[PDB]
Amino acid sequence: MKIFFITSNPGKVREVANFLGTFGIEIVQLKHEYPEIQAEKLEDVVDFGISWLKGKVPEPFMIEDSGLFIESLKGFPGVYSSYVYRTIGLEGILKLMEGAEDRRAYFKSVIGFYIDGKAYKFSGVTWGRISNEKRGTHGFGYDPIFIPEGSQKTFAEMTIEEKNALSHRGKALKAFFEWLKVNLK
Amino acid sequence: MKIFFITSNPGKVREVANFLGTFGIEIVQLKHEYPEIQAEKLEDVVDFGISWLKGKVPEPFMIEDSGLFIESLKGFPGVYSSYVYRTIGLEGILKLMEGAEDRRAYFKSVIGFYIDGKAYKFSGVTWGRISNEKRGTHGFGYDPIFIPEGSQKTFAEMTIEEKNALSHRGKALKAFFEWLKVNLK
Numbered sequence: 346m347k348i349f350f351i352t353s354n355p356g357k358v359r360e361v362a363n364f365l366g367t368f369g370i371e372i373v374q375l376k377h378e379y380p381e382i383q384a385e386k387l388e389d390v391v392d393f394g395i396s397w398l399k400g401k402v403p404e405p406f407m408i409e410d411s412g413l414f415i416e417s418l419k420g421f422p423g424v425y426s427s428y429v430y431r432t433i434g435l436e437g438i439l440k441l442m443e444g445a446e447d448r449r450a451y452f453k454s455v456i457g458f459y460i461d462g463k464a465y466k467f468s469g470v471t472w473g474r475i476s477n478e479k480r481g482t483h484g485f486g487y488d489p490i491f492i493p494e495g496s497q498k499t500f501a502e503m504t505i506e507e508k509n510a511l512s513h514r515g516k517a518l519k520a521f522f523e524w525l526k527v528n529l530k
Numbered sequence: 531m532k533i534f535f536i537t538s539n540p541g542k543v544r545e546v547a548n549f550l551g552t553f554g555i556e557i558v559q560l561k562h563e564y565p566e567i568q569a570e571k572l573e574d575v576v577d578f579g580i581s582w583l584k585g586k587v588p589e590p591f592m593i594e595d596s597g598l599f600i601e602s603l604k605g606f607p608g609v610y611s612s613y614v615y616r617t618i619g620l621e622g623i624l625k626l627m628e629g630a631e632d633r634r635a636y637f638k639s640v641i642g643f644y645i646d647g648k649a650y651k652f653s654g655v656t657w658g659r660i661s662n663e664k665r666g667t668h669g670f671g672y673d674p675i676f677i678p679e680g681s682q683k684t685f686a687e688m689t690i691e692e693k694n695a696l697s698h699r700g701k702a703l704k705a706f707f708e709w710l711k712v713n714l715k
């Protein structure tokens with residue numbers, strides 16, 4: 346089937362297309378700006394986005410909201426991961442984490458899917474830790490400073506395939522695909 | 531006249547009431563949660579808030595959205611000043627500004643007012659610099675680390691009256707009051 350991915354993030358598109366493409370699903374990116382509310386939960390941002398987008402973009406469509414939540418920073422940047430990335434950057438995160446030994450954090454991805462007048466959500470979480478310095482040139486955003494649990498390499502040191510197998514987005518996609526198999530045969 | 535101030539911030543209420551009270555205006559705080567969109571401009575957050583609140587709260591009513599925009603941090607925390615304050619706090623800002631000599635920044639306040647089916651906005655901006663350490667116990671939020679231009683004391687070292695005479699909120703209120711004088715006699 347064909348799904349329109351409403352996003353401005355090219356990295357997210359590659360990861361989604363790579364994952365679902367292997368199952369014959371066609372992903373077409375569509376950069377259509379939509380309202381993102383300030384909220385504590387990525388789920389709420391997605392709900393609002395879908396409600397606003399319905400009737401304005403082709404169907405079926407999907408959107409995604411994700412963030413990096415750092416323990417020693419009380420969850421920051423979280424829902425505002427994008428804004429923080431564009432302002433203080435990875436250097437800012439590292440500066441804030443200077444000297445800290447508890448570098449635990451988690452990435453969370455929430456995918457929203459809309460089809461036949463109904464909305465559905467899928468999520469995935471991957472805990473890890475913030476590295477001491479930037480490492481790797483693959484991926485995007487915070488990938489250079491995030492090491493998923495059970496791995497020595499940062500997301501930036503992995504191929505798209507390796508990242509999808511361990512990331513928050515990969516887990517959300519797995520849940521999404523399992524739902525498609527039993528519902529949208 | 532009586533105005534309902536839709537906010538959860540007690541500091542903002544004291545400052546607004548103190549300012550407008552001197553002109554016989556009654557301010558009644560009403561904690562009614564309303565959607566705040568993610569945006570680049572405080573003005574957009576206010577527009578959305580008013581559009582959602584109309585018909586849900588008594589009239590006339592006002593809301594306010596403000597933030598601290600730090601130059602060396604590319605405007606951060608800005609529109610997300612509240613979230614940042616609750617997570618990394620003043621310590622986070624100081625840590626990020628460690629060693630920096632260009633500590634310029636500005637506070638901006640945008641007040642939205644709704645009456646007789648129409649919305650109106652008023653704003654004020656006050657440039658200053660981030661101090662090297664926390665100073666003062668008056669005010670709220672970032673007051674302990676913000677020194678308005680032309681002053682040696684941080685907002686936290688001033689009385690409500692002294693702060694209103696120099697702050698972004700005080701300027702927005704001045705514009706708001708001047709508008710009331712010529713329109714809502």
Ligand SMILES: O=P(O)(O)OP(=O)(O)OP(=O)(O)OC[C@H]1O[C@@H](n2cnc3c(O)ncnc32)[C@H](O)[C@@H]1O
Nearest residue numbers: 352353354409410411412426427430485486487488
């Ligand atoms: O909202 P769209 O249009 O989909 O694209 P976006 O870049 O704005 O994506 P979000 O608003 O949902 O949150 C984006 C931030 O989260 C971070 N992020 C999300 N997933 C990531 C991943 O897999 N690897 C590294 N960083 C990621 C990234 O640094 C971004 O600045």
Ligand SMILES: O=P(O)(O)OP(=O)(O)OP(=O)(O)OC[C@H]1O[C@@H](n2cnc3c(O)ncnc32)[C@H](O)[C@@H]1O
Nearest residue numbers: 537538539594595596597611612615670671672673
């Ligand atoms: O939105 P309401 O319900 O009115 O209350 P709020 O606290 O959430 O206010 P905002 O969302 O508009 O942005 C709040 C942040 O901006 C900062 N701030 C705003 N005005 C300030 C002032 O005059 N002095 C110090 N900090 C201020 C403060 O630290 C807050 O965390």
Ligand code: NA
Nearest residue numbers: 381409410411
């Ligand atoms: Na998003």
Ligand code: NA
Nearest residue numbers: 381410424427
């Ligand atoms: Na977002």
Ligand code: NA
Nearest residue numbers: 353381410427
């Ligand atoms: Na976004």
Ligand code: NA
Nearest residue numbers: 566594595596
């Ligand atoms: Na506000």
Ligand code: NA
Nearest residue numbers: 566595609612
């Ligand atoms: Na706000």
Ligand code: NA
Nearest residue numbers: 538566595612
């Ligand atoms: Na707010």
